[PDB]
Ligand binder design. Structure first.
Ligand code: OK2
Ligand SMILES: OC[C@H]1O[C@H](O[C@H]2[C@H](O)[C@@H](O)[C@@H](O)O[C@@H]2CO)[C@H](O)[C@@H](O)[C@@H]1O
Ligand code: CL
Length: 515
């Protein structure tokens, strides 16, 4: 599906895509290979959908956080630069694009949010979130507002949510069992935001465009944005500074740090062309300058050029915020985490849910994959061997234990009553190895995805997995069970995410079958 002898590149509409296209023309000069740069809407949602069918761009640009998802689904080429090239970029940038030990992208630039303030309105920007209300009242008396930023994307609100002890996945590797979305710190940050809105210091409908227009016209004294934004402010002749984000309850705002990264599509027939492009045209002083001059990249991964721009106090401020922040995890569940928190912030801001209701649903949504896997993996393995897993359930272990106990009753019942259809389907598929299992997964993915949503169909999906798992054990294919459990889990949580959260996840399963 992807055309050989050219390069199609996807990059977000806020990045320097005219600059990248100029690096594209220089490549075409040397090679006679045309480079098309596109910035489609939602490209971070479209890439996984199209790339799975062997379609999409040759190169996708996004922050590193989405790339583990892409790599796990087999959508990215392993990149293998030689030592001489690896040494040209900061090790910590390479770390951002490492997944299960393999480099899955080229790092381009380190991004963090800063407080951007209009020096003519606000000579001294506020050190604390707590002083922004009184600053707003002072500025409204003069026909201005204190602060506007994008309330539609949780990336911009996260630094406040995280300040007093909100976190996504705990680090001390990343404990995926430990989600800090509905703890006291997260509640405190989101409550402060909702109070700002309730008190008319901010408007819940403010998005990227409205904040940018209002700051760049000198109507609001402050915004929160990344380096990409600076170009448009330079154009506006607002006298702006870039500074440390305000503290909350005495603690730094903790922005989620992104490394803008360039991944090669696994389905691309143009991998050597993509590698030559990214290594020897883009990731050079001249290539990054071309992009940076269009929309600023931040602290670039390329040591030689980072040194040249390091003296810029806007970069200095970006790295001060990044140091108070945390590098985003690249784990496959990041997409689910962001979707959950996006919904929680929009709903709390709008009044559709209270902060407690919004962050509860977000915690459920963020924990959904790992919780579902634990139940589904334990059911298939204990069905297959006749022996339960001794290891303790961990956090939400009561939910997991009671869901496992319910599924034992209800799942054993479907395997007994539907033995005929299950044996029939198992006998048709000639399951004798991991290849046969992967093929089954593809079919079962289709049949489950295509049908209606209720606990019975969900039990049927998991119970068929149990039925198959018993087969795999008896034919010395036990190593195929975990990958089957991961397949079932993946399609369950991806295709029924909203319904599952609406039911309070596995608590709803336990209550629905309570007798
Ligand atoms: C495992 C399965 C599925 C199935 C998957 C499947 C299919 C093919 C594969 F290769 C692998 C997995 S993933 C999946 N996920 C959800 N539901 C599924 O099935 C149900 C229908 C169903 C079938 C059999 C037993 C029970 C049962 O539903 C009980 C139920 C339903 N709704 C509420 C409450 N209870 C459905 O789609 O609604 C499936 C679909 C049809 C099906 O059998 C259909 C009958 N066939 C006749 C011909 N024979 C050779 C074969 C049998 C079977 Cl065995
Ligand atoms: O809002 C959730 C969103 O946050 C990040 O996306 C940032 C991106 O890193 C920046 O490069 C810039 O474009 O703004 C985006 C926010 O609108 C995550 O990278 C992304 O995965 C996540 O969905
Ligand atoms: Cl409100």
């Amino acid at each position: 599906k992807i055309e050989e002898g050219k390069l199609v590149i996807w990059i977000n509409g806020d990045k320097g895509y005219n600059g990248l296209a100029e690096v594209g023309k220089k490549f075409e000069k040397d090679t006679g290979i045309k480079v098309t740069v596109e910035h489609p809407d939602k490209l971070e949602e479209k890439f996984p959908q199209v790339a799975a069918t062997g379609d999409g761009p040759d190169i996708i640009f996004w922050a590193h956080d989405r790339f583990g998802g892409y790599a796990q689904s087999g959508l990215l080429a392993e990149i293998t630069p030689d030592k001489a090239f690896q040494d040209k970029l900061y090790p910590f940038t390479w770390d951002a694009v490492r997944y299960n030990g393999k480099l899955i992208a080229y790092p381009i630039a380190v991004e963090a949010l800063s407080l951007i303030y209009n020096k003519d309105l606000l000579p001294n920007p506020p050190k604390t979130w707590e002083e922004i209300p009184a600053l707003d009242k002072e500025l409204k008396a003069k026909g201005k507002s204190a602060l506007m930023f994008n309330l539609q994307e949780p990336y911009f609100t996260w630094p406040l949510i995280a300040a007093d002890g909100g976190y996504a996945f705990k680090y001390a590797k990343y404990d995926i069992k430990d989600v800090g979305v509905d703890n006291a710190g997260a509640k405190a940050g989101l409550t402060f935001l909702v109070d700002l809105i309730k008190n008319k210091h901010m408007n819940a409908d403010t998005d990227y465009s409205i904040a940018e227009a209002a700051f760049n016209k000198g109507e609001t004294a402050m915004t929160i944005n990344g380096p990409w934004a600076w170009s448009n402010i330079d154009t506006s002749a607002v006298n702006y500074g870039v500074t440390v984000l305000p503290t909350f309850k005495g603690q730094p705002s903790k922005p989620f740090v992104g490394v803008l990264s360039a991944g090669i599509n696994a389905a691309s027939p143009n991998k050597e062309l993509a590698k030559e492009f990214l290594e020897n045209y883009l990731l050079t002083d001249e290539g990054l300058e071309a992009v940076n001059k269009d929309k600023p990249l931040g602290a670039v991964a390329l040591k030689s050029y980072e040194e040249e721009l390091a003296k810029d106090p806007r970069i200095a401020a970006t790295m001060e915020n990044a140091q108070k922040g945390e590098i985003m995890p690249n784990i496959p569940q990041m997409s689910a985490f962001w979707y959950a928190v996006r919904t929680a912030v929009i709903n709390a801001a709008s009044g559709r849910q209270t902060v407690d209701e919004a962050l509860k649903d977000a915690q459920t949504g963020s924990e959904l994959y790992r919780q579902s896997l634990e139940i589904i993996s334990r059911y298939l393995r204990e069905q297959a061997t006749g022996a339960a897993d001794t290891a303790p359930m961990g956090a939400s272990g009561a939910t997991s234990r009671k869901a496992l106990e319910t599924l034992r009753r209800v799942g054993d019942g479907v395997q007994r009553n539907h033995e005929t259809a299950f044996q029939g389907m198992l006998r048709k598929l000639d399951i004798k190895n991991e290849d046969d299992v992967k093929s089954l997964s593809r079919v079962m993915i289709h049949v489950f995805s295509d049908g209606v949503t209720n606990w019975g169909r969900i039990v049927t999906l998991i119970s068929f997995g149990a039925f198959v798992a018993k087969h795999l054990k008896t034919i010395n294919q036990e190593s195929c069970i975990e990958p089957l459990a991961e397949s079932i889990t993946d399609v369950l949580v991806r295709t029924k995410r909203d319904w599952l959260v609406k039911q309070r996840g596995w608590d709803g399963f336990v209550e629905f079958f309570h007798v």
